Amino acid sequence: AYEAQYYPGATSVGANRRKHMSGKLEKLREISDEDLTAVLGHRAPGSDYPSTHPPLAEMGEPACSIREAVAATPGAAAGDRVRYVQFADSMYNAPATPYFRSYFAAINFRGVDPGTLSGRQIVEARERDMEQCAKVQMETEMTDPALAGMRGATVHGHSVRLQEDGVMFDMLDRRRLEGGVIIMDKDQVAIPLDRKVNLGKPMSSEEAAKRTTIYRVDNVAFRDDAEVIEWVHRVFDQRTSYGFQPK
């Protein structure tokens, strides 16, 4: 019906912001479920899904119209715990942005809790839901594994300049580049793991600048895209004028 346009801009970063909001992202590599659950870190890998309350078909529901109209997720129908996945995105042309992963998770996924910090971006959901959300974030162009690496605490590096091989300065290294392809063993929480997870080959610097959603005076300056500054000015003028008098 209403074809969502999602964002203003004829530029490249407007197109990439629309691609992150819409979810029309191409898959660059693959992560198995067994080691993805390992690097989320809330569970033994390849084990049963835990619980925080008995499943909804057993302990019933109140007589609610929203409950009978909204079909709960499969990850909530089994009463899983609410656990989290979070990332850190560089300011040197990372493909995703702490707001724009939150916009991605809000539009493309049912029953999530996206949260934006300046350096952190968290998705909190039921077990089977956040696993799918984190899987879709990891296997696509949305996460550049050299850039948008999973942290769960001690996240410093969104604004720290990259290393010479294009990886963030992590005060506890989850992800290491050697062997050619990027590999990582720990979960987002700062505990080590026995198994090694290959992600894939990192994007090149020019490909990172092409795929990014950051206006940068190096690559695509914010000042030259008047289409989005007009959006900011229009919504700000409407906010101020209608906070004086809404007519």
Partner: protein, 432 residues
């Protein structure tokens, strides 16, 4: 003149073409009855008084007067307490005064007369007269010693008067003391979301609606609806809370099985465009339709209705109460991105969601969504378009919150869910 229709909890028609001026807190008889009942009604935990008299624990948190336990029988003789307290709380003979014993005697519900409300300057007449009537009954008709009377009084009242709240007392209503108001006219906003979801028996249309009732009564009491702002508030009260033209339930039924926040936004912008509320101001390069509002109170009403609908779709999917920290925020943010128009309350409910996310997800002492009310320092900013969604989220939960409905609001829920105009707010306000 704006003339909405009214639909119920299940999206059936209630009253059609109602003028939204008649839905005002100062004009609608049902909202007036609801807030007069919130003023005049108070709850007594008889088992709490019995435990305080026996164990000696009274007067606050972690306190116990040791050595002067009064072994009384309050729960067993609860009915005679009910007629005796009804005798001491009433002004005339059977005017509008009721004392009902419930749940096999563990609790009492006291409706103060309507005259005592109009005889004092605020609502605390009900609390003080009920507490003093209970104290006087348990002293006189169970035979309390002359020097044992203050123990029997502080079993009912708290550390009052040394603390301005009845802290540790067993008598409280929905509204808290007027010294606990952050602003002027905020007395109808000291009502936490657990109370609303407990009252409506965890209905999610009904908790949102009754928190709209309370919030817009509070807003009109602030003097924040004079002139054209009255229409600006009443359009949102119709559209968001009171289910105008079945819009929110229609959006939920459309986006129930597969819907996310984005599909809710697509539905509200399709409804706004097709209703003539908004139109394309200009078209940019790359065809980004810049939108303008033909009616700004009506566009804010659509953004509020979409905010509640997105709350439903994003909380019923997870069956979690914590999602409205972000659902309001990101609904209004994607809605600003989609059209160019400002979101609900011109960013006020987005800011409320911003701060609500921080105190409901960090080391700062905010806690779960169940404890947030309109008088809370974080969620007071939006003009009654945020707390309906919070109460709906709390009513929509399935057990993932420990600061839960029962633990903090079992008394208020089991005493105030006995009233028809509190479980069913839309049916009262519509009048069918």
């Amino acid at each position: 003149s704006d003339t909405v229709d009214i639909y119920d909890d299940r999206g059936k028609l209630l009253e059609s073409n109602v003028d939204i001026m008649s839905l005002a807190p100062t004009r609608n008889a049902a909202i007036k009855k609801i807030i007069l009942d919130t003023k005049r009604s108070v709850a007594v935990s008889l088992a709490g008084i019995q435990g305080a008299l026996a164990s000696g624990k009274m007067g606050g948190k972690g306190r116990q007067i040791l050595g002067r336990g009064l072994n009384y029988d309050l729960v067993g003789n609860a009915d005679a307490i009910a007629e005796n307290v009804k005798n001491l709380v009433q002004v005339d003979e059977g005017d509008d005064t009721s004392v009902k014993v419930i749940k096999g005697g563990k609790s009492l519900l006291i409706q103060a007369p309507s005259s005592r409300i109009a005889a004092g300057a605020d609502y605390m007449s009900a609390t003080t007269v009920g507490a003093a009537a209970v104290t006087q009954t348990i002293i006189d008709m169970f035979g309390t010693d002359m020097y044992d009377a203050p123990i029997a009084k502080s079993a009912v009242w708290g550390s009052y008067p040394q603390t301005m709240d009845l802290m540790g007392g067993n008598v409280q209503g929905v509204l808290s003391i007027p010294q606990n108001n952050e602003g002027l006219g905020f007395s109808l906003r000291n009502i936490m979301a657990n109370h609303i979801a407990a009252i409506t028996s965890r209905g999610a249309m009904n908790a949102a609606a009754l928190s709209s009732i309370y919030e817009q009564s509070g807003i009109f009491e602030m003097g924040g609806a004079v002139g054209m702002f009255e229409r600006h508030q009443l359009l949102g009260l119709a559209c968001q809370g009171l289910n105008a033209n079945n819009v929110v339930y229609d959006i939920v039924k459309e986006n129930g099985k597969d819907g996310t926040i984005g599909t809710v936004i697509e539905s509200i912008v399709g409804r706004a465009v097709e209703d003539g509320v908004i139109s394309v101001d200009k078209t940019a390069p790359s065809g980004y339709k810049f939108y303008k509002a033909n009616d700004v109170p009506m566009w804010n009403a659509y953004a509020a209705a979409g905010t509640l609908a997105a709350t439903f779709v994003n909380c019923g999917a997870g069956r979690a109460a914590q999602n409205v920290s972000s659902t309001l925020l990101y609904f209004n943010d994607i809605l600003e991105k989609e059209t160019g128009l400002p979101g609900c309350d011109y960013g006020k409910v987005q800011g409320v969601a911003v701060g609500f996310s921080f105190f409901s997800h960090s080391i700062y002492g905010g806690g779960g969504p169940g404890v947030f009310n309109g008088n809370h320092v974080v969620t007071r900013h939006s003009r009654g378009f945020a707390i309906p969604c919070v109460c709906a989220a709390v009513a929509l939960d399935a057990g993932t919150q420990m600061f839960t409905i029962e633990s903090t609001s079992g008394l208020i829920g089991d005493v105030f869910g006995s009233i028809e105009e509190f479980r069913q707010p839309i049916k009262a306000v519509a009048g069918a």
